């Protein structure tokens, strides 16, 4: 797992660190990015995968 960071600025640094440190090229069975959203106007959650 990789948490991608919290702030926008550090997130780019984490992304490029994963780019240039031999992370996804070789083995990489899957990537599995996932997100969640909240809509309080209608009170609905959303699972994004």
């Amino acid at each position: 797992v990789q948490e991608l960071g919290l702030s926008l600025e550090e997130s780019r640094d984490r992304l490029r660190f994963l780019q240039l440190h031999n992370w996804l090229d070789n083995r990489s069975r899957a990537v599995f990015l996932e997100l969640t959203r909240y809509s309080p106007a209608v009170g609905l959650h959303a699972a994004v995968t």
Partner: protein, 476 residues
């Protein structure tokens, strides 16, 4: 017997030809091209040279801002002391267009207590209870001040997501392009469409003096609380200066003749229902009469209430530098058109009462009237099964397919599936299982079972009717 039937048929034929003349007059020669050119000028033009998006395919709020100061201004003002504008060198732009905004207030939505640290603003969905009524931004003019519905001479609209009020924050644009561009730029700079906005309206009208036909244009953009943009449009041709040519007088004469015919039918109906046959409803040829009379009376009342309320035209004609209010007339014209179409359809259906002049036509009518009961009895079960499938599809596929999003849309999708007008990709990718099962079982049980049982019933009824008439006639 038949002697009075001849008189009844003659009167019905005169009524039918009068109605046909009236409908041909109301639906005149090709005004389709008028609305065609207007729509293609405003709906199909890309918002800019680089972008390929238009009004019909709006995606975000920035696209709306690009369209407003963009394709709209290009299609509104045409060059040819502050001269008017002719859109196609034929259509005159009446007065000025108007833009309007409907928005909600911040705090009409209670977020959970344990989450009140990362988020602090929630905007509810649109409702008259939660509508904003306070000034905002640089509060200078009518664009940053709430104006009531009765002060705007407005009314409801019944858009797609909800029904929108006639109030909001409005702004009247100008007659020249530079002034309107400056106004729209000033609106965009001092941010006018924030997260609280819920609907935007643009209204204007044109004349096209060559033919005598006004056109009212209304464009609506809805911003749902869940995000996105939903565009819609409404172009309506009207006629408010009717009495110009001879054909107009001919149509007026046909109108008063139609009124006299309706009065005659009402008098006949009352006279016959009063004296005898106080039950009067076991015929199905008398319910049609009352339905036709009611529809025609409603149409006459709507026409009377609509043609006499042309005061807005008089107010506009004494000051042509103001926005003309023509939405009510368009709404009532649409209602009148719907009622007239239904009435003429039923008048045409009424012709079945008189097509009986030989043994071939009598037996077909007898067969239809005899099998109507059995057809209704089986259609109850057919519709129960149809609605079961519709509700299952609505509950399962309703949130992913764009074609099962509403119950009526599910019904229409099923009716299209009957015609073979379905695409299997979306229904399958929405659900790997229970997707193919639904489609296959529906098609099989609808074409192999339900469609053939109707034929069985109809054929049995027709066979027994024909056989019993043949036996009675051959043995008398």
């Amino acid at each position: 017997y038949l002697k009075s039937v001849l008189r009844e048929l003659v009167t019905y034929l005169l009524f039918l030809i009068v109605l046909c003349i009236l409908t041909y007059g109301m639906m005149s020669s090709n005004v389709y091209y008028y609305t065609r050119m207007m729509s293609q000028l405003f709906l199909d033009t890309p918002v800019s040279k680089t972008e390929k998006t238009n009004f019909k395919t709006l995606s975000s709020m920035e696209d709306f801002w690009k369209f407003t100061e963009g394709s709209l201004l290009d299609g509104l003002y045409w060059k040819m002391a502050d001269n008017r504008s002719f859109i196609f060198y034929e259509n005159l732009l009446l007065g000025v267009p108007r833009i309007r905004q409907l928005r909600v207030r911040n705090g009409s939505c209670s977020i959970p207590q344990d989450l009140r640290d990362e988020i602090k603003e929630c905007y509810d969905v649109y409702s008259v209870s939660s509508e904003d009524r306070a000034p905002f931004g640089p509060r200078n003019g009518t664009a940053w001040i709430y104006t009531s519905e009765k002060d705007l001479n407005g009314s409801s609209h019944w858009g797609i997501i909800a029904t929108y009020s006639g109030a909001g924050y409005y702004l009247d644009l100008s007659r020249t392009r530079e002034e309107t561009a400056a106004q729209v730029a000033s609106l965009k700079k001092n941010v006018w469409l924030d997260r609280g906005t819920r609907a935007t309206f643009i209204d204007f009208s044109v004349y096209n003096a060559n033919i005598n036909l006004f056109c009212v244009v209304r464009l609506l953009v809805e911003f749902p609380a869940t995000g996105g943009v939903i565009p819609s449009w409404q172009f309506q041709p009207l006629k408010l200066i009717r009495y110009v040519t001879t054909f107009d007088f001919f149509l007026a004469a046909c109108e008063i003749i139609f009124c006299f015919f309706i009065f005659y039918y009402v008098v006949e109906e009352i006279l016959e229902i009063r004296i005898h046959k106080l039950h009067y409803f076991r015929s199905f040829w008398n319910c049609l009469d009352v339905v036709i009379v009611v529809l025609s009376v409603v149409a006459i009342g709507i026409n009377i209430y609509r043609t006499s309320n042309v005061e807005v035209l008089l107010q506009f004609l004494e000051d042509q530098n103001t926005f003309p209010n023509f939405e009510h007339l368009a709404y009532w014209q649409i209602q009148f058109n719907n009622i007239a179409a239904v009435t003429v359809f039923f008048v045409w259906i009424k012709l079945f009462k008189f097509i009986n002049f030989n043994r071939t036509m009598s037996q077909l009518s007898t067969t239809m009237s005899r099998c109507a009961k059995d057809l209704f009895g089986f259609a109850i079960m057919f519709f129960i099964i149809f609605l079961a499938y519709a509700q299952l599809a609505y509950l399962v596929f309703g949130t992913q397919v764009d074609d099962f999003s509403t119950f009526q849309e599910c019904i229409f999708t099923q009716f299209r599936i009957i015609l073979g007008d379905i695409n299997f990709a979306e229904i399958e990718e929405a659900n790997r299982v229970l997707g193919p099962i639904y489609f296959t079982t529906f098609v099989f049980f609808m074409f192999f079972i339900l469609l053939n049982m109707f034929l069985a019933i109809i054929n049995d009824t027709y066979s027994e009717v024909k056989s019993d008439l043949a036996q009675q006639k051959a043995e008398m």
